[PDB]
Amino acid sequence: GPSSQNVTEYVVRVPKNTTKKYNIMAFNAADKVNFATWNQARLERDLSNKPEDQPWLLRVNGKSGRKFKGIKKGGVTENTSYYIFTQCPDGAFEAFPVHNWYNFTPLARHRTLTAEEAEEEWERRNKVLNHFSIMQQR
Amino acid sequence: RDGKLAKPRQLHNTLWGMVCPAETPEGHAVGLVKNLALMAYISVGSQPSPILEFLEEWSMENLEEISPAAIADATKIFVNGCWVGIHKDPEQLMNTLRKLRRQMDIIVSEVSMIRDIREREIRIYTDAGRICRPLLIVEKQKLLLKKRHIDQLKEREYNNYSWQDLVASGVVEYIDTLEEETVMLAMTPDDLQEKEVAYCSTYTHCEIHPSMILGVCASIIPFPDHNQSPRNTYQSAMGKQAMG
Amino acid sequence: FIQMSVQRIVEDAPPIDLQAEAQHASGEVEEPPRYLLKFEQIYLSKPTHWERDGAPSPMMPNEARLRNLTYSAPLYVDITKTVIKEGEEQLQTQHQKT
Amino acid sequence: QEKMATNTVYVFAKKDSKYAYTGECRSCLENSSRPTSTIWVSMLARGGQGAKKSAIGQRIVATLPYIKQEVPIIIVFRALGFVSDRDILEHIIYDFEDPEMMEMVKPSLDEAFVIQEQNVALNFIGSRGAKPGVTKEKRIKYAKEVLQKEMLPHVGVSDFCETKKAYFLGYMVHRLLLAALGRRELDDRDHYGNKR
Amino acid sequence: ESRGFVENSYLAGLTPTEFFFHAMGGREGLIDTAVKTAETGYIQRRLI
Amino acid sequence: FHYAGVSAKNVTLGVPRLKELINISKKPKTPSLTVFLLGQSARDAERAKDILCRLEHTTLRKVTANTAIYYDPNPQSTVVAEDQEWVNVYYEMPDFDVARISPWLLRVELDRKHMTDRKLTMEQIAEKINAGFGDDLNCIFNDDNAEKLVLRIRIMNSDENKMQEEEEVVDKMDDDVFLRCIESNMLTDMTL
Amino acid sequence: AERGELDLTGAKQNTGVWLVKVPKYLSQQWAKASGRGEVGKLRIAKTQGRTEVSFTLNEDLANEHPFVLQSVGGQTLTVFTESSSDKLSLEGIVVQRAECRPAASENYMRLKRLQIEESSKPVRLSQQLDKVVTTNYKPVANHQYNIEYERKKKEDGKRARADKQHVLDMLFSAFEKHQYYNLKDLVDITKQPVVYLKEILKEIGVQNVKGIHKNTWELKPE
Structure with a gap:
């Protein structure tokens, strides 16, 4: 076959209103995230900036089960609007406007290298020879 | 001023048709002082953005909309140093932009458009201060102009047929040095159109007349080439020294 | 340059607003006064010169040579004065042509 | 008056000094002020040290605006937040399949690990900028303002447009890298097309 | 010609291209002369 | 510079040398020296070339065709199978203290064209390298008649206290980096 | 049930959505959507070695747009929402991206006109003024000064001293908030000459430079 034989026609509507703003949530394919592993998620605007402009903070599978930061794209409707097209039970198509583009990226967990206690100084002395031991001394 | 020693003055070859070589003071400021060519012109500066929007429509990929690695094959296009995008088929784009350029829908007097296969790049500049000059447009190793158009130029003495219309005619275009690097310039319409000894026939444009290189002063003295070259510079200075 | 560039600078960032000091304890004066300034099109008169009687006259470039005057024209502007006075009388606007 | 064209990165040799190669681009605003925004990427040729690393001559070292001294280009990339080398490499070249381009950049990668965090990188750049006391919010905040305004204003x-800014710098380095590798020809100063 | 060879004579005249290469060398003589003129005064002073 | 004289354009002509001379600069802008040849060297090119080989400056970097760093489990059962008989055949070498030398292998390829170029030999090279670096650097090489000139080196890990004896938390020297410090030093410092 | 809680239903349903790029002039036609919001009809023809999708405008909306399908590979795309009740929801994952392009309906002239039509502005250029002399009226006295006058005449700072008592009482009130105050601030509470005020601050207090030069006064600890 149908990908090489089927011929269909469906109606398209563009409603002048919606009950919710529509945004894009983009992931790097290279990560190949299993969405099934997402039992739950939390989603909040990022707190570094202390609203609509705020980057998103996504917490999946608990506070530290999975966490990503989403950064807004420069533009989304600067030349061409983006639409979400959805199939309805009547076969007709429904189109939804894209309000914004946020870029989501993965985020390492606990590790913490302060690089301020003496590491800024230690670099001045650095001969490229050691790096691990400071991480234990903390 | 900035950047000194081991730089001096002599001459650059691209200056051909851009500045008269003889038109300089015989003082220490020699070569340090330059003079405008007979038919050279300067860019006033424009905004590529409206043109840039059609480009997005012509199908030019945005920087944040694609991953550079995902589009290794496409030619990168540059405008005012700014990387506007890439196009998988630059040649039609170059041809289309030029035909728009030839259609006068693109300002030949301002818009420069250059492509380097070696770099796999297309650079465009519409900033002020760029030097350009008009050239004859050679097509199929032949001139694009018609003798009837001359009659139109004759009609202009009474009625009208503006030089701008000749510009609008697109049989001639206005040309910067960046464009010159890529064009195959012709010395003369007559001899170069000959095939009998056509070492090349890939000519793209031709000079209106070699005298157009000359400045106000050099233009005064006849057959400067039968004369020693500095004498003309001395004349160019001394002409300025004359009473009248 | 005359046609757009000076205007682009006028297009750039001439709007300025200023707020008076709070001058604490004054009382119940609702907050310190505030003033904003706004600009529109820039205007240029034809080259002219003002004779000692204070009156204007056309600036003939031939006249400029003889009287050793500097060939120049008057430059004029649309100016607006605009009160987010931080009082009950917000959005009260006053026009100048300066 | 004859000047050099702006917003155009050019590479010249600086072999008269400790600097093997240099890449320069001024990034003046299109109308706002034309501040100049001179940028130098200079290739340093202290082609030796002692017993420390046997190879200092591969360290480039960016010249940032207003900063009291020069700092590695790669440190800026950490300030850009691209902690993953793969992401910086794409920024450098969409085609890292050439091992030669890979080996030449490798010594700059060795520099990258002394600081991984964007925040530390911003404070670092700020610490190079000046000494606003221990308040390393200010050095970061200042770095943030330079990164936005003082760095490549022309884009x-x-x-x-910081991520977008990042995309220009890598080509700028890449152009430097081709010329530093020798794949690119040295730009002429006498050329008028490179002039205004 | 592509490298500056002037084949013609002063009687024959010069091609547009040859004239330019001819003009360029005239600068080299003239610039060197101007520079040489200033420096001799200075070198002599050191000498005297 | 009208001067040709079948040679390089030395002692830059005239005023800049005259200006410099008046300024008595500590060193000429263009230093030069004329080498005369006594007896046969004046008539024998071959003798003059022999002098040419003796006089002429030669860096180690000038001499090397290529360098590479390898992980080699066994000095004789090397992973560089092409060199494998070449290492394996050697046995008269004190291979008792090599049971602790750098497991890492460093190998350099030498330009036979250079050997043609400056008329050089392998024995001169091996003896040069050991004299500079001392006994601490193990050095082995194939014959000039091989498919290619390569020299593979090891650090002389003298069995005893060179084995974390004092644990001194400093890491006296990592191997990998040390092959690079020597190689950085090997190319840049040594004049053959 | 929380504000920062994101619904994952769409994703966990593996809900798919389509993404289409549309020109603004068409999108401007679409803001005038016919009826409830209908804009037209989409036509899809697939063959053994060719697939064609296009959209046709509503006859009402009119008073063929072929689609270019684009890859979504290299970057996983999903759609997430924010309700007018600020509730958050993931509707789906993007299974298709596409772009609306012209075809055999325009060369350039209309587009040029369309660009011109969208603008409808003088770009900001200085279009004359031609010539004026808007000389400014002399107000015989400075206006603001005059405005100052209506205010000035209402009250004077030259007030009376029936207060070798009311002012000290007020002093207890101020100094209850902080031990020491600046002289100008002391002048603000008062309505009397500073020299007279100086006489009072000397009477129940002393003063400082407080390590800030400023004549700062405080009540006597003794």
Whole structure:
């Protein structure tokens, strides 16, 4: 076959209103995230900036089960609007406007290298020879 | 001023048709002082953005909309140093932009458009201060102009047929040095159109007349080439020294 | 340059607003006064010169040579004065042509 | 008056000094002020040290605006937040399949690990900028303002155009890298097309 | 010619291209002369 | 510079040398020296070339065709199978203290064209390298008649206290980096 | 049930959505959507070695747009929402991206006109003024000064001293908030000459430079 034989026609509507703003949530394919592993998620605007402009903070599978930061794209409707097209039970198509583009990226967990206690100084002395031991001394 | 020693003055070859070589003071400021060519012109500066929007429509990929690695094959296009995008088929784009350029829908007097296969790049500049000059447009190793158009130029003495219309005619275009690097310039319409000894026939444009290189002063003295070259510079200075 | 560039600078960032000091304890004066300034099109008169009687006259470039005057024209502007006075009388606007 | 064309990165030899190669681009605003925004990427040729690393001559070392001294280009990339080398490499070249381009950049990669965090990188750049006491919010905040406005103004000082800004620098380095590798020809100063 | 060879004579005249290469060398003589003129005064002073 | 004289354009002509001379600069802008040849060297090119080989400056970097760093489990059962008989055949070498030498292998390829170029030999090279670096650097090489000139080196890990004896938390020297410090030093410092 | 809680239903349903790029002039036609919001009809023809999708405008909306399908590979795309009740929801994952392009309906002239039509502005250029002399009226006295006058005449700072008592009482009130105050601030509470005020601050207090030069006064600890 149908990908090489089927011929269909469906109606398209563009409603002048919606009950919710529509945004894009983009992931790097290279990560190949299993969405099934997402039992739950939390989603909040990022707190570094202390609203609509705020980057998103996504917490999946608990506070530290999975966490990503989403950064807004420069533009989304600067030349061409983006639409979400959805199939309805009547076969007709429904189109939804894209309000914004946020870029989501993965985020390492606990590790913490302060690089301020003496590491800024230690670099001045650095001969490229050691790096691990400071991480234990903390 | 900035950047000194081991730089001096002599001459650059691209200056051909851009500045008269003889038109300089015989003082220490020699070569340090330059003079405008007979038919050279300067860019006033424009905004590529409206043109840039059609480009997005012509199908030019945005920087944040694609991953550079995902589009290794496409030619990168540059405008005012700014990387506007890439196009998988630059040649039609170059041809289309030029035909728009030839259609006068693109300002030949301002818009420069250059492509380097070696770099796999297309650079465009519409900033002020760029030097350009008009050239004859050679097509199929032949001139694009018609003798009837001359009659139109004759009609202009009474009625009208503006030089701008000749510009609008697109049989001639206005040309910067960046464009010159890529064009195959012709010395003369007559001899170069000959095939009998056509070492090349890939000519793209031709000079209106070699005298157009000359400045106000050099233009005064006849057959400067039968004369020693500095004498003309001395004349160019001394002409300025004359009473009248 | 005359046609757009000076205007682009006028297009750039001439709007300025200023707020008076709070001058604490004054009382119940609702907050310190505030003033904003706004600009529109820039205007240029034809080259002219003002004779000692204070009156204007056309600036003939031939006249400029003889009287050793500097060939120049008057430059004029649309100016607006605009009160987010931080009082009950917000959005009260006053026009100048300066 | 004859000047050099702006917003155009050019590479010249600086072999008269400790600097093997240099890449320069001025990034003046299109109308706002034309501040100049001179940028130098200079290739340093202290082609030796002692017993420390046997190879210092591969360290480039960016010349940032207003900063009291020069700092590695790669440190800026950490300030850009691209902690993953793969992401910086794409920024450098969409085609890292050439091992030669890979080996030449490798010594700059060795520099990258002394600081991984964007925040530390911003404070670092700020610490190089000046000494606003221990308040390393200010050095970061200042770095943030330089990164937006003082760095490559000609592409835009908007926050989201920082990632976009990053894309120009890598080609700029790449262009430097080709010439430093020798694949690119040395730009002429006498050329008028490179002039205004 | 592509490298500056002037084949013609002063009687024959010069091609547009040859004239330019001819003009360029005239600068080299003239610039060197101007520079040489200033420096001799200075070198002599050191000498005297 | 009208001067040709079948040679390089030395002692830059005239005023800049005259200006410099008046300024008595500590060193000429263009230093030069004329080498005369006594007896046969004046008539024998071959003798003059022999002098040419003796006089002429030669860096180690000038001499090397290529360098590479390898992980080699066994000095004789090397992973560089092409060199494998070449290492394996050697046995008269004190291979008792090599049971602790750098497991890492460093190998350099030498330009036979250079050997043609400056008329050089392998024995001169091996003896040069050991004299500079001392006994601490193990050095082995194939014959000039091989498919290619390569020299593979090891650090002389003298069995005893060179084995974390004092644990001194400093890491006296990592191997990998040390092959690079020597190689950085090997190319840049040594004049053959 | 929380504000920062994101619904994952769409994703966990593996809900798919389509993404289409549309020109603004068409999108401007679409803001005038016919009826409830209908804009037209989409036509899809697939063959053994060719697939064609296009959209046709509503006859009402009119008073063929072929689609270019684009890859979504290299970057996983999903759609997430914010309700007018600020509730958050993931509707789906993007299974298709596409772009609306012209075809055999325009060369350039209309587009040029369309660009011109969108603008409808003088770009900001200085279009004359031609010539004026808007000389400014002399107000015989400075206006603001005059405005100052209406205010000035209302009240004077030259007030009376029936207060070798009311002012000290007020002093207890101020100094209850902080031990020491600046002289100008002391002048603000008062309505009397500073020299007279100086006489009072000397009477129940002393003063400082407080390590800030400023004549700062405080009540006597003794």
